[PDB]
């Protein structure tokens, strides 16, 4: 639907994924943090190419499509919430219910036959771990848990994060994240030196192709992901060589991190432990449009008591956010951006030359092609 | 010619109008005020996607296409008017007559076989009511009166206004203008308060459909337009309700305005009376390109003599311009801009959901579709 | 390939030239000066649409395509030259030899089957007269002399130059350069006045179409060019008329310049003498992309010894660069830019109306169409 049929034919083994330029419909996605949206103060945003309005009403979140049924203007241009339960289009005063999208009133024509007989599209919203998730799909939504990595929703897991808009397609973000050899870019990181991480330059793989990854299609709440097991049989590269001469060494720190690395639909990486042995990193690459994503970073630490919680809050702000979420991950941002040109025309998917450590990436592409819950197209974006 | 055939065959009610992205060829359009162009001071502008040069020579206006026949440069990059009767291309000095566009000389080669054997496109130009009209069309022009709203050319009707370039397709401007229910956007206008206007929110129509409008396809000078009769038999709305509760009230002033609204080919709106009961508004939405229009506003007031004309002028500069043409219509500007996205891919025309107040707009689309004097295409712009 | 057949079929005689939007493959092009590329300090540039990296290693220049075979990033985003012989991609550390482009190492997996089995595209590079030439082509290069104008490579010819990026297609630049009537744009030039150059407004051509130019294909190094001979038997215009009336005069002067004007593949103009009787100007219009070129300007002066070289350089910096290469040729830059719109949709090639002195340009279009060594296409750029 999205990509020239010529290219799609050439990537048969994961063509649904190459097509999913705008992301995967019928999944939950994080778009902002709970505390960024107050009572009665609506926010606009674009998710999988659709402009959305989110409002907090009696503590509860609601999401309407930010496009009037009449002449297709964004309501956010001028928000007129004249009652608690409604929003009034600034243009001809079509008035919709936040709860169900129902065109309940037209102030400029009380007697109109459209009234009660049209519905602005709505999307479920759920708040969890101080994160706002929207189900960008059709019908009654599945549990949040299906579209979140293992442990994100654990009772004791405290979640702190950061969100920004990055100018690359979401998939370039995903693949960079789940790429075992890309850790080469992080070799001069501030986190690596100052927090004494053990970090190889990469891995010389071992075993058959089936031992590189473990596909998880078999989760009890219905998660779909791929674990990267290149470390299992692989030999870490700590002395990098050219013509058999050593020209670069990995970092020989004492702290062991990134034991498990996994990628889950709809596109969320989990690295454990990271950036410290007492934490995990959960990060989403959410489609905004074909060129843009929210980089939705979260750090998780199990906490029992408030003093634990408040201590973590403080470590997050003084160490982890600036030294890890920025320090470390800023290189991931540049790397994503640097792939834009080669994949901009959709030709990159066929002219790329992969090598052994990309097995993980390929397993993700296959996984994503088979278990996605729909492909967002221009038809979803338009009408 | 301009819009995907797939889109056109799904707007069979008014397909030529949806195709008329660059506007309609073979009509007169206003592009500036007489006073804005002095003797021997050529001005460049773009009309229906064509770059034009206008000049005033011995008080009379002339118009040439601003594109040399030779290497297609705009003459206006460096205007060389070396005799009153001619313009000389800065590049290789092909020299053309203003009056007929004939290539009469070439300074770089006076023996060229091209001399007297080529002609640069000219367009008729005529001034009326201190407005400059160009006949962007072919062959002999009709009277100007055909393409102007009734009373605009009355001998006592004094015209003053303002012109600006607005980034929306000309049709978005037109429909907004002739939209009985968009009046809602003006409810907190300073004009409405300080000039004490009887402006409602909107209307509940009365009776037949054919009855909401009056099509004028039968005007003696060949005018073609639609009058809005929504509230000849239709009840106007002053108290806007949601779930029975009044949430908004219209305008409570003593002056009755906008008793007759009409839209005329090629795209000019008459609002009578407005913004005061002794005035009319005549405003054009002139296609510059696919994305842009001149918003050529005028106010007309009958004046007996130049004394009453001075008073009107004072009242215009001091009151009506800042309060009406800016204050009031500034809202019309950002409303047009708000429809751009939805209509940009030509998909807005199939995906819009209209209601009863838009009976007027649909009649216009059909009027325009039947009675236009031609569709401007890229073929006219280029070749 | 690059241009629609609807157009190419209407320019028989020079359709390959019209197709050569990105320029001609399998020629040498100047891109920068020797002084600008230092030992161990690579630079990126785009030539014929392709991003390239140039390095100086043991004084010798090398050129690699600036696009990793792996995920198609530019290496130049973050240059890692870890030995004198190699460059290492910053992303996953694929390591390429400069000399032959072979993938000789990968620091992230030194056991990859990819090693020794892949080759990054290289191009030959060669320096002459302080200028850096890249052979943007396949296989083994011809001598550089084929792609330089005559006398440029002469033992005694001191070359001093200037280079900048200009926003027009390269062909618009060439055509303006070699256009015998374009001199009209130089009539108010400070160089013409202050150096008292004899400069007609143009030439009334002298007799036979077949003899306004001389094609050269027999040259000892296989150079391919056209000489403009309009001035051989042409009558100069010093008194330009409109309706018999003298409206502009040419520039009388002692100094006879530009009696020898030639254009050469791949796109280099020689004007001799210029801007003084004992100098000449060689200038290239080097395609960067469809919209953009390097305007690579040089002045040549036979210098017998160092006193001559040093006083030439004094003259260049104080006089010839600001008055000639900047003052005079600034008008050529605007002339090129003014033709962009007409040729941008490829329709200018069919809609242009030529006159007698354009014979020179047509001779060049046919020469170029006959003797170029390949058309650069999008598939050379991408894959
Ligand atoms: N993928 C990783 C492998 C080893 C160590 C750290 C990471 C990692 C963690 C968070 C974000 C990233 O982009 C990473 O590469
Ligand atoms: N082509 C020329 C003809 C007469 C005088 C000067 C020139 C000339 C020399 C160098 C660069 C240019 O653009 C010129 O027009
Ligand atoms: O949008 O504004 C106009 C156009 C310009 C001035 C005043 C207008 C007006 C008044 C009453 C009904 C519809 C209307 N359209
Ligand atoms: S555009 Fe929202 S009511 Fe008309
Ligand atoms: S472009 Fe106008 S005379 Fe050549
Ligand atoms: S993109 Fe260069 S080594 Fe991977
Ligand atoms: Fe990373
Ligand atoms: Fe020139
Ligand atoms: Mg002189």
Coordinates of C-alpha atoms in Angstrom, one line a residue, chain A residues 172 175-176 179 181-182 184-185 187-188 201-205 237 240-243 247-248 334-335 338-339 341-343 345 351-356 358 361 365, chain C residues 51 67-74 77-78 80 82-83 85-86 88-95 104-114 118 378 382-383:
Chain A
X172 CA 15.7 3.1 11.4
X175 CA 17.0 -1.4 13.9
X176 CA 19.7 0.9 15.3
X179 CA 21.7 -3.8 16.2
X181 CA 27.4 -4.3 16.2
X182 CA 26.2 -0.7 16.5
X184 CA 30.8 0.5 18.1
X185 CA 29.3 4.1 18.0
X187 CA 32.8 3.4 22.4
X188 CA 33.8 7.0 23.5
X201 CA 33.3 -3.1 20.0
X202 CA 31.2 -6.0 18.8
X203 CA 30.9 -9.8 18.6
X204 CA 32.3 -12.5 16.3
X205 CA 29.2 -14.8 16.2
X237 CA 35.8 -7.9 20.3
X240 CA 39.9 -4.2 17.0
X241 CA 42.4 -4.9 14.3
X242 CA 43.4 -3.8 10.7
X243 CA 45.9 -5.9 8.9
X247 CA 44.0 0.1 16.3
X248 CA 41.2 0.4 18.9
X334 CA 22.9 10.9 14.8
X335 CA 23.1 7.3 13.6
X338 CA 22.6 9.2 8.9
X339 CA 20.5 6.3 7.5
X341 CA 19.1 9.3 2.8
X342 CA 19.8 5.6 1.9
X343 CA 16.2 4.5 2.9
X345 CA 13.4 6.4 -1.6
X351 CA 20.7 -2.3 -1.9
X352 CA 21.8 -2.8 1.8
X353 CA 24.5 -5.4 2.3
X354 CA 24.0 -7.1 5.7
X355 CA 26.5 -9.2 7.6
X356 CA 26.3 -11.9 10.3
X358 CA 22.3 -8.4 11.4
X361 CA 17.6 -7.3 12.7
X365 CA 11.8 -7.9 10.4
Chain C
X51 CA 28.9 11.9 -2.5
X67 CA 28.5 5.7 1.2
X68 CA 29.1 2.6 3.3
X69 CA 28.2 -0.8 1.6
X70 CA 26.5 -1.9 4.9
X71 CA 23.6 0.5 5.8
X72 CA 24.5 3.3 3.2
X73 CA 25.6 6.0 5.6
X74 CA 28.1 8.7 4.6
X77 CA 29.4 12.0 9.2
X78 CA 32.2 10.8 11.4
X80 CA 37.7 7.3 11.3
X82 CA 42.7 4.3 11.8
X83 CA 45.7 3.5 9.6
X85 CA 45.8 3.0 4.2
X86 CA 42.3 2.6 5.4
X88 CA 36.7 2.7 9.0
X89 CA 33.0 3.3 9.0
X90 CA 31.9 5.0 12.2
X91 CA 28.8 2.8 12.4
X92 CA 29.8 -0.9 12.5
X93 CA 33.5 -0.4 11.6
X94 CA 33.6 -1.9 8.1
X95 CA 37.1 -0.9 7.0
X104 CA 39.7 -5.6 4.2
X105 CA 38.5 -5.6 7.9
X106 CA 35.4 -5.2 10.1
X107 CA 36.3 -4.3 13.7
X108 CA 32.9 -5.4 15.0
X109 CA 33.3 -8.9 13.5
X110 CA 36.8 -9.9 12.2
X111 CA 35.5 -13.3 11.0
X112 CA 32.7 -11.9 8.7
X113 CA 32.5 -13.7 5.4
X114 CA 32.1 -10.2 3.9
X118 CA 33.3 -6.5 -1.1
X378 CA 20.0 8.2 -11.0
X382 CA 21.6 5.2 -6.1
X383 CA 21.5 1.6 -7.6

